[PDB]
Design an enzyme around this catalytic site. Structure first.
Site, PDB file in Angstrom:
ATOM      1  CE1 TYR A  89       0.050 -38.911 -49.317  1.00 48.69           C
ATOM      2  CE2 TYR A  89      -1.451 -40.376 -50.341  1.00 48.69           C
ATOM      3  CZ  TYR A  89      -1.028 -39.551 -48.926  1.00 48.69           C
ATOM      4  OH  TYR A  89      -1.538 -39.569 -47.921  1.00 48.69           O
ATOM      5  CG  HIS A  92       9.608 -39.224 -54.424  1.00 51.20           C
ATOM      6  ND1 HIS A  92       9.310 -37.815 -54.583  1.00 51.20           N
ATOM      7  CD2 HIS A  92      10.588 -39.276 -54.689  1.00 51.20           C
ATOM      8  CE1 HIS A  92      10.478 -37.250 -54.873  1.00 51.20           C
ATOM      9  NE2 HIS A  92      11.317 -38.241 -55.077  1.00 51.20           N
ATOM     10  CG  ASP A  93       4.935 -37.243 -50.991  1.00 47.04           C
ATOM     11  OD1 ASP A  93       5.705 -36.680 -52.146  1.00 47.04           O
ATOM     12  OD2 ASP A  93       3.733 -36.704 -51.004  1.00 47.04           O
ATOM     13  CE1 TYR A 147      19.905 -36.680 -58.797  1.00 46.99           C
ATOM     14  CE2 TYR A 147      18.787 -35.969 -56.637  1.00 46.99           C
ATOM     15  CZ  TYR A 147      18.835 -36.495 -58.094  1.00 46.99           C
ATOM     16  OH  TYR A 147      17.538 -36.444 -58.797  1.00 46.99           O
ATOM     17  N   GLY A 152       2.153 -34.987 -56.362  1.00 53.33           N
ATOM     18  CA  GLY A 152       1.921 -33.656 -56.626  1.00 53.33           C
ATOM     19  C   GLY A 152       2.388 -33.152 -55.236  1.00 53.33           C
ATOM     20  CG  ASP A 169      14.774 -37.274 -56.548  1.00 55.69           C
ATOM     21  OD1 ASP A 169      15.395 -36.441 -56.926  1.00 55.69           O
ATOM     22  OD2 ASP A 169      14.242 -37.482 -55.550  1.00 55.69           O
ATOM     23  CE1 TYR A 211      12.903 -36.855 -52.342  1.00 49.17           C
ATOM     24  CE2 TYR A 211      12.381 -34.350 -52.529  1.00 49.17           C
ATOM     25  CZ  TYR A 211      13.059 -35.827 -53.227  1.00 49.17           C
ATOM     26  OH  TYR A 211      13.614 -35.271 -54.322  1.00 49.17           O
ATOM     27  N   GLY A 238       2.592 -32.692 -51.359  1.00 51.75           N
ATOM     28  CA  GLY A 238       1.919 -33.169 -50.052  1.00 51.75           C
ATOM     29  C   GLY A 238       0.733 -34.140 -50.723  1.00 51.75           C
TER      30      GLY A 238
HETATM   31 CA   LIG Z   1      24.141 -30.790 -53.481  1.00 51.96          CA
HETATM   32 CA   LIG Z   2       3.074 -35.632 -53.073  1.00 51.56          CA
END
Ligand SMILES: [Ca+2]
Ligand SMILES: [Ca+2]
Ligand SMILES: [Ca+2]
Ligand SMILES: [Cl-]
Ligand SMILES: [Cl-]
Lengths: 124, 124
Positions: free
Chosen positions: A28, A48-49, A73, A30, A99, A52, A32
């Site tokens: 994971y 993290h994926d 951000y 990278g 993140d 998102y 996808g």
């Molecule tokens: Ca922004």
């Molecule tokens: Ca990934």
């Protein structure tokens, strides 16, 4: 944004080379992924994926190209400690935390060189 | 984001007190507006408003609460000079430039104290 995430990583892990170390790792870390994570670090990446994914599925948020990595951000680094600015809007805050949690997760997970540039087609 | 715009103003005009000096000034330096700007500064504000209007009318952009002031971007200040990070996404870049052009416009426009807290209901 993607560039800020790499900076967050250098923050939590001073010696790190984000792109070189954490890209194309396990199943994971990278673009996808597939299968089950091979270790803690790889799982940090899967999380993290998924994070998102949850962000893209927020009715209230609409990221450019539907890619959270484009969402910029505000955050600050202070002695390995990452801080997401309270003034980021809800969507930005969500991405900032994804993140941040990932950067921290990376800093506490063992780094198994054997899982670097893994043959995903077979082991993922 | 709104907080970044106020910072941009302090950058281009070191002694400034953004909120106190540029809010509720003339016909456009504040929330919304009406009529024609009373002077250069007031026009800088109208232009900023129009700039935000053009941004909201971008098919490719969707700001939270449809308010560009919630859109956080990346910028840096260096000796009165403001720089919008090239890595901001198209929408963020558009907002960053609106704020930057406004901050610069403010720094070069005469400040007429008589136009501060003007009776908009009559002169706008
Ligand atoms: Ca922004
Ligand atoms: Ca990934
Ligand atoms: Ca206005
Ligand atoms: Cl990365
Ligand atoms: Cl202001």
């Amino acid at each position: 944004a993607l560039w800020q995430f790499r900076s967050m990583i250098k923050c939590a892990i001073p010696g790190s080379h984000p792109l070189m170390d954490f890209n194309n790792y396990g199943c994971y870390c990278g673009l996808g992924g597939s299968g089950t994570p091979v270790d803690e670090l790889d799982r940090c990446c899967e999380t993290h994926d998924n994070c998102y994914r949850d962000a893209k599925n927020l009715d209230s948020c609409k990221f450019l190209v539907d890619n959270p990595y484009t969402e910029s951000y505000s955050y600050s680094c202070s002695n390995t400690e990452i801080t997401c600015n309270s003034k980021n809007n809800a969507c930005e805050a969500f991405i900032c935390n994804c993140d941040r949690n990932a950067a921290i997760c990376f800093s506490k997970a063992p780094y198994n060189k054997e899982h670097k540039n893994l043959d995903t087609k077979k082991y993922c």
